[PDB]
Structure formats: structure tokens, C-alpha cells
Amino acid sequence: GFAWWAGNARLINLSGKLLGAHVAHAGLIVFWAGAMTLFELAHFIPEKPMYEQGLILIPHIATLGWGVGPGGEVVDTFPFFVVGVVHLISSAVLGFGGVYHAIRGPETLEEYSSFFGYDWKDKNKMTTILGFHLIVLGIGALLLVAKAMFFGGLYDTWAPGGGDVRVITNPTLDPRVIFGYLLKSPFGGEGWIVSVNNLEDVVGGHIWIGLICIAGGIWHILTTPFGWARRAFIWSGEAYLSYSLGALSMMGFIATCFVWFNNTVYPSEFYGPTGPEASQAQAMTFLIRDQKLGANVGSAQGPTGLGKYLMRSPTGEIIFGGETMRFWDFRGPWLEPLRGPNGLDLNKIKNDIQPWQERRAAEYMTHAPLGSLNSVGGVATEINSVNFVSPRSWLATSHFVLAFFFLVGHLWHAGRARAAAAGFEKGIDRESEPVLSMPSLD
Amino acid sequence: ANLWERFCNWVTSTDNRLYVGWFGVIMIPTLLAATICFVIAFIAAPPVDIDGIREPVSGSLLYGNNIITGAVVPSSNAIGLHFYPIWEAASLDEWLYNGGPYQLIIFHFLLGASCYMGRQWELSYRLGMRPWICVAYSAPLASAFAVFLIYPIGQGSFSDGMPLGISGTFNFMIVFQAEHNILMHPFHQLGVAGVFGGALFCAMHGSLVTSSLIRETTETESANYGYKFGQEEETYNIVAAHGYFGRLIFQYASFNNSRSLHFFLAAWPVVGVWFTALGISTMAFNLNGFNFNHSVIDAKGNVINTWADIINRANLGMEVMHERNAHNFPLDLA
């Protein structure tokens, strides 16, 4: 029925060829991870911050604790090479199986084996496949716990002394903390799960997620959907695809905000400062400069009547002034030493700012995530000179686009799955037009 | 004949003059709340300190505005992205000064508009239609999300969301160009092409069908009476339209499949406006239009200005003047 431009829809009921398509596609994913890492490494220069070099995968490896030491200094590039080569090699195996199952292997699986074959309408089999993959995912989350607790730890930007790799010995298990995140507001100062700011919570959350996934996998292998679930869903391959498209969409939107706001599992050492961070750093920089000149930054009234350097938040906290008043929820390792119970402490500001804090603020202010599509860094009126676009801008924008299109994909396939299941996806039957058997509205 | 089943039958009834539906159950209260608050605020709200600098901007008719200058003003920069419902304020007077109404309106509206899209799917299903009209509507809906939610999220403040007013919209536009060079961004260029091309094809299709209406009336009556609602035969000659337009350009540049033609009419402006919504949504994360400032220099190194450098001069003017009292430090990083 389908034209060439909808040709992959011809795979819907060819489980053997559809397996080859999926597995070949997995090889493409692993290929890109392998080749991109090597490309990044071939281009890597250790004397430059990662975020001056357009790197997005090496920062992911460094965050896992490989290759870096105190302060995020790259100490050994060989773990980067290995991660890239092993991914690259593995894509050949997946490509091999993919093209075999798509070209030469059995066209449909259910004749060859009742285990690997499936009918989309077989709700017992479908939840069994789901359960297997839930278990795999649950194992996946425990690998991160394993790395954090038993195989060298994770990079900790909050570690005392500038940041460092740290083994996690007390992951958070208290479900009031772990699930407390799921119930925080997504609005400013709260930030939902994006506000996770320590590795103990991160590792603890992954223990929970691994157990829940494994438990849920066994649940779904052992059961079949209850009647309320059976009457509420469409049971077809396109429906299942549309559900997953909605899920991927939601996750891309979350990831966008994660990389834009979070400086814990996206360390600024690697990814550069956040929007809020760089804006806070500029206020810090000129507070420092002016105070060195003799300014009493606590008592300096600015043009509006609010403090030129320091003011109150709407709940009273002493915060940086100027337009950065909007970013007072920012928390970062270079700034927290200056915070007392009421916000920024004026005695610490007068007496306890260190050179390393001055350097970091100067660095972050001049690496704010602003830049042009052709990678001219800075505000849009800046002249050419600085070749720079923050990895956070690259990762946020790319994944917003993908997340949006996958939401459209969900709508497309959800509406079509409903229409196909009811029998009118191809148009209206002239001899049985529903509206013609309905009473008029007037 | 159970009481819950009778409610369910009324909600999803195709006999209601206006379809309600399950999406409508959410849509109707949220749109009414947003509408009522907007009308009242537009007429009577006191000035709002949008930029958090204790410099309130007067938006409503009773405070000296007309239809063109009036607005519901965005909420205070001091609030940022914090949630500010009425019950978080010490008083309605506080809530009004800080721009609480804007938050109430845009949140209720985005919810109600999202349910509006769902409602379009839902009735199409009850009538046995194909389902994708709601996909057409996702393009204007995404555009509303971009200027009311996404851009404030990336910039850290609803004070930088688009005001609910005519002059406030132009303010948003001018400031957007100074800070993102949106004109030089290809997704906005694609949006212009989707909007210009959409107007073009609207006029084309309208004129080609009108040009080939089959004679069915006299010169003393509207030709429109030559069509009767629900008649089985087409009302124009598409082969005559194809014969005209194919000769106006060349044969293979003209459609003779009406389904292909109407799909094209659907896809062009929808995809163009998707891209422009995505443009706002990605400039929210400061990935800005092309920068060719001082890209041409001569053999000695003199800058040779291009039209891009003239654009920059205009952008600089908007930069240095906007929110003239709100910046204490040299870089406007958000």
C-alpha cells in the first residue's frame, strides 16, 4: 500500500527484516560514538579548556572519571582513545548482523522460532519483550553505580580543592530525598530533577532506578495487561512507536534543561559555564575590581536606587545586583564560599575572596554561552576574533529541535494509529459517511 | 444507563453545537480564566515593574494607554523564573505591581491552547476523519510556546517573554534583533519563506480555482450561488486551471493531482513556521544569527564594510538604548 517515501512502513509485519533495520541502525549509533570520539581526540589539545574546542563526547567521558585529575586537568588521553576504538569496533558487529537480518536472513521470524517471533497484537509477548529490555536498562543504571562505587568513582566539581575524581561510598538511599526531587516544582529556585547538585543523590537515584527497572521487567515478563489497560490503549506496532516517540520527546526536553542549568553532572570545567553562571561571574568580576579600587560595594546605591553590586532577592537573600538579579538561584563551587545564612556575606566578600575565585569568574564571564551560528563568540554585535560557541548552547539547541520534532512524530503516528485501528486512515467511505447519518447542528 | 456513562456520553457527544471532549474539559476552564484576567488587566491593571528596577511600565487603558500601546506587562525581573501565583503574594496590590497577571494568563493560555490542539485530534476521531489537522496547528502553537515559555526559560526570566500587547510585541522584536541578529538567522529566513510563500500559494490557489469556475449563474447574481453545500460534483474545472497554469510557467511545474496540491498547500507554511518557532526556541539558548562583522578586510587590514556591518550599527543602537536603566555592567549576558 505504501509509496517509496513511506517505504519503511512496509517493514511493519516483516519481523526479520525489521530486526535487521533496528540492529543496523544501532550500528550507526555506535559508529558515530566511536568515530566522533576519535575525531575529537585527534583534534584535542590539553592546554586549552575542553569548551574552547567544540567537544561534546570527551566531556561525557571525563565526567565518568576517566582521563582527568584535580581541577579537571586532562592527565591521560588513553581512556578516550579506548572508549572510541571499542565503540567503533563494535559497530562492525552490529552492522554485520543488521544487514544480514535485513537482506539474507529470514524475512519473518515467527516461522523460524516462537521465541523470537512476535505479533504486535500479542499483548503477552509484547510485555515480555518490554520486560527483557527493562532488565537490560536496569543493569545499565547499575553500571554507573558500579563505576562510582567500585571502579574509581566520578568527577566531582564540588570536591574540596577545585574539583577531583571521587569514589562514592554513601549513595543516598532515603526515598524522601530521591523521590523528593520528582515532586519539586520545575519553576525557578526549585528546578525539579534538574536541581540535583551532589553525586551521592545521583548515585543513589541510579540504585533506585536499576532496582525499579529490574523489578518492573520481571513483573512484565510474568503478567499480561489488565482489562482497564486493555480498553485504554491501541494495540499495534504504530501505536507502540507513537508511545515511544512521546517518551523520547519528553526526555529530550528534560535533557535540554539539564545541560542548560545543571553544573553537577555537566561540570563547567568541561562544558563551560552556564548562562546563569556566566552572568553571576560578571557581577563578581566587577565587584572584585571596584572593591580593589576602594569601593564599598555593600553601600553603593546604583542608578535605580537598588544596590549597584548587591541587593535583596524577593525573599530577602543578599544577591548580586543588576540584571543578574534573575539568576540568584545559581549555585556553584567558586561562589558558595562567599555565602552565609542570609545570602552573600559582606564580611567574606570584603576579606576572603581568593585569586582562584577571581580567575574563575573572569574566565566564566568571558566564556558565557553566547555566539553566532558561524561560531563567533559573544553578543551578536561583537566583531570577529573569538572562535567559540559553548557546548551547552550546542547541546541545548540540538536537543530542543530533536525533542520538538519527536513530539510532532508522536502526534503524527498517534493519530494515524487511532485512525488505522478504527478503519478510516485511508479516508471516508462515500457510502457510509458518519456525518451524513448524524442530525444537523441547527 | 449509569450516571458516569451518561456524563461520558455528553462530553464526547457529536451532537453538541460546540464539541466539548476530554481535552475540552481542561481547555474550557483554562481559556476562560486566561481570557477574563486578560480583559480585566488590559483595561484596568496598574503599572508593572517588568524589569525589576522599581520603574513600573503602564500597560492598561485606564492608566493612559490606547489599543496600540496597551499591554499586559511581563512579570518582574526580580521574580525571574519563579512561580508567582496569587497566593504567594502578600496582597493583590503586591501581585499587580510585580506583574502576576501575565503569569496567570500565559500559563492558562498555553495549557488551553495545547488542549485546543488535542481537541482537534479528538473530534476528528469521533467524525471518522483523518487525524492530522492538529499537526498543522502545532506550528502556531509551537510559536506561542517559543515566545511565552521557551525564550524566558533560556534567558532566565519571564520579564523577557513577549508582552501581551501590540507595541510590546514590537519591543520584543527590536530587542530580539539587537541580541540575537535574528534577521541573519536561517530559521527566521525559512519562516519568512513559509509565510511569504504561504500568502503566495493562498493567492495562487484562490485565483486558479476562481479562474476556472464553471458557468452556473447569470451576470446579475453572485457566482457563489453556483455552488450548493454538499453537491457531489466539483465546482471548477481543474484541467482548465492546469492548462492555464502549466502554460504560464511550463507544463510540469503545474499540479494536476488535487490531493498533491492541497498537501503542498498544507506543508509549505507549516514547515516554514516550525522552523521559525525552532529559531526562537534555539536563540533562547543564544545560538544566534550569522555574524559577519568585519569579515571583509583589505590587503593592509582596513575593515571594508558590507551591508552586514551596517546591520550591526543599527543593532548596536538598539542594544545601547534598551532597558536604559537596568544594566550596571558592560556585557548584557541575558
Binding site: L436, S440, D442 | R17, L61, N66, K228, F229, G230, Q231
Partner: peptide, 30 residues
């Protein structure tokens, strides 16, 4: 007087909405 005028015109449009929806000429088939 100008506030009164703007609001008046706006109110007339809302009333027109009501008649245009609920008191339209009913579309009748063929």
C-alpha cells in the same frame, strides 16, 4: 471617553461573535 470607546467597540465584537455562531444561517445539504 476614549477608554469607553475602545471598550464599547470590543464589546460589540464579542456580541457579534455570539450571533455569528449561534444564529448563523444553517448550512443545508444539497
Amino acid at each position: 471617553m476614549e477608554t469607553i470607546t475602545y471598550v464599547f467597540i470590543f464589546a460589540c465584537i464579542i456580541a457579534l461573535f455570539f450571533f455569528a455562531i449561534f444564529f448563523r444561517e444553517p448550512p443545508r445539504i444539497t
